[PDB]
Symmetry: D2
Subunit: 215 residues, 4 copies
């Protein structure tokens, strides 16, 4: 447990090079975000393929063992959801017997994290999932409380990871992608509560930003 | 608006005749649910079929106006999740333009509802979502809390509604199926956080029952 | 001489399919039906999601029986399309998640082709050099077996090449008058003798793209027969 | 007869495909590769996902330009299966959710075998809107020869859809009307592209490696 937020021996996320993108012209963008998204960074399909592997990583990892996954509610809604879909199916086609469910959901809200009694995790596998840890002070503060109950393990799954130079530098043990620190909307990422329903993790327009700033 | 929980406009739910099931055995049931299930009320594929249908109906009812769907947390993941998927997709292939997102998502846990600072829905169109609605000591209570902010619309969308001998029991506006008063697990349907990940909705067993505690 | 391929279209040792009781039907108004079919579809036999859930299981069975060895599946063109498609998708996916070792792919696809009011039931299955099925496990996928003529005929034709085992998978079997008929090895539903359409079932090239297996209505028969 | 029928193979007034710069690949590693393909796939060109996403946009495109008018889609055997099938799936759906009624199915499928195309009577097509489907137009023969045949029956139009399009030197060829990607001249396999009937079932479009090549025929 001392290793947390460090990614001790993770498999490195897929590297997405600086200034690399796709034209939205090339996809079916829904009319409403239509005029706001100029560049796609992660296509919805790429995300799903990558996430499929992630699940597999995780499945082979806690196989034959109770896994307690936690959704930091709001933003983790897409990934976590993809994730649970894949584990479920994976274990179903597995053919390796296991008399336990692929995982156990749990929900929490936020900035500090807000949860019920954590006594439930004493001596258990704890997988906390997020869309991204842009700070991890909140992850560190919650991780603290998590420690006290003596859970069996505690890891972090994160969709994205920004190579920045401004933070508290916490890292997941299961990362989908490693990206240019740029602004991203879509795929549950949002501006001002906007773009969550777009399928592609897009780069935020100077235009999206205006309209979605004020008038 | 005075019609909440009343089911006034409502198109009638897919009606499932009494004592009608399918054997689990001719389905692919993940090893950790094998000893447990025997009869299947609803194949997840039948339920994705119905829900696609409700999505449409809903899409048809709020086209071009903002929609705020509140997900009563924990028990409504399945349904809620399957719903925005469609909602959004339908919006995309409609080619009939709208400057508005398919929906705005919101989460409320908690047998009272553990709120949020719901003033925001001051004239919005709100659809509350539930997996099933057996009673009303909450659905009716939160409905009143809402009512006070003069939201522009109030409707409930429920996956299931058991045919019952009760009264003043809420009715949905967008209802999935009408099933008899039976004990069902799976497809998010619970039993001590049990059978959630199972695809379909199963009638449970004394068996499934027995095993599930500390005895 | 090649070894003789034992039972074939017997149905020897198979697992019986989902049994669908007579007069069991869902109502079209309860699902989303597209406009081109709307006016003609009232009763639904098998809701397309139901048949996915069902073929998921068939594929599981198919996997367990040929896993680890080459499996060559033949798609009888036009009809067997949807069913076949659903099947290789599951097939390869299961293969992919099994985390259970194999140096051979899920399958190798193959395609072939082929009475009514005045003619003859001599739909003769046509294909290339069959010689490629020698010592191979072959699986013939049909959307339904209705005369067994064409499959008995092809059957003979394939037995001459000495394939290693030769089975048949069909989406539905109709409960109807007969004996002296081919029975599939892997089959999804047992249904009563009613005229179906949709989900790749057709009425004079119609309905294939409808997503559920429905019953043919008098209006469909009318609107779409020979004028 | 506006927006002709003599432009076939020209790809005139098309919408240029998605452009995939040279030397752009993903690591196989970052994907879940099936055991049987594991040692042969080192690099990925087009992740099966990116493919569905492109095809979704092709499906819409094809929809808009044929709405309410019968479309006949000819799939070219073995090779164009995956792509063909992603197409008609999206087509069916997009029409199901359109709210713009057509009184006609979203398509009529037909299949052809193979290099000459192996058709049956093409009479079925007189007056028809015909869309032809390929994983790729390798060279011009097959199509041109076939287009000649088709044109003999006078379709209402004949267009080509192709998934991939290669940047090549030999250009005196067919250009597609609806094409997925523009790629580098590299040897690919997966997502219905095979190497001697190998890797059709793989999910992604991979580059043909030497091991797999060295291993799948001439030893
Ligand atoms: Mg977060
Ligand atoms: Mg609930
Ligand atoms: Mg047939
Ligand atoms: Mg081809």
């Amino acid at each position: 447990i001392e290793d947390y937020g460090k990614g001790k021996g993770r498999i490195e996320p897929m590297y997405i090079p600086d200034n690399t993108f796709y034209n939205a012209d090339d996809f079916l963008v829904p009319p409403h975000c239509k005029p706001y998204i100029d560049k796609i960074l992660l296509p919805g399909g790429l995300v799903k393929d990558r996430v499929e592997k992630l699940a597999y990583d995780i499945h082979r990892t806690y196989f034959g063992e109770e896994l307690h996954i936690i959704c930091i509610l709001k933003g983790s809604r897409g990934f976590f959801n993809l994730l649970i879909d894949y584990l479920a199916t994976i274990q179903k086609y597995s053919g390796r017997e296991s008399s336990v469910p692929p995982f156990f959901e749990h929900y929490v809200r936020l900035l500090t994290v807000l949860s019920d009694d954590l006594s439930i995790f004493r001596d258990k596998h704890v997988l906390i999932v997020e869309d991204i840890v842009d700070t991890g002070f909140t992850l560190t503060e919650f991780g603290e409380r998590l420690k006290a109950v003596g859970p069996k393990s505690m890891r972090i799954a994160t969709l994205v990871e920004k190579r920045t130079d401004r933070s508290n530098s916490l890292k997941g043990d299961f990362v989908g992608f490693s990206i240019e620190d740029v602004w991203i909307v879509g795929c549950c990422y949002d501006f001002n509560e906007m773009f969550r329903d777009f399928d592609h993790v897009a780069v935020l327009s100077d235009a999206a930003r205006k309209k979605f700033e004020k008038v």
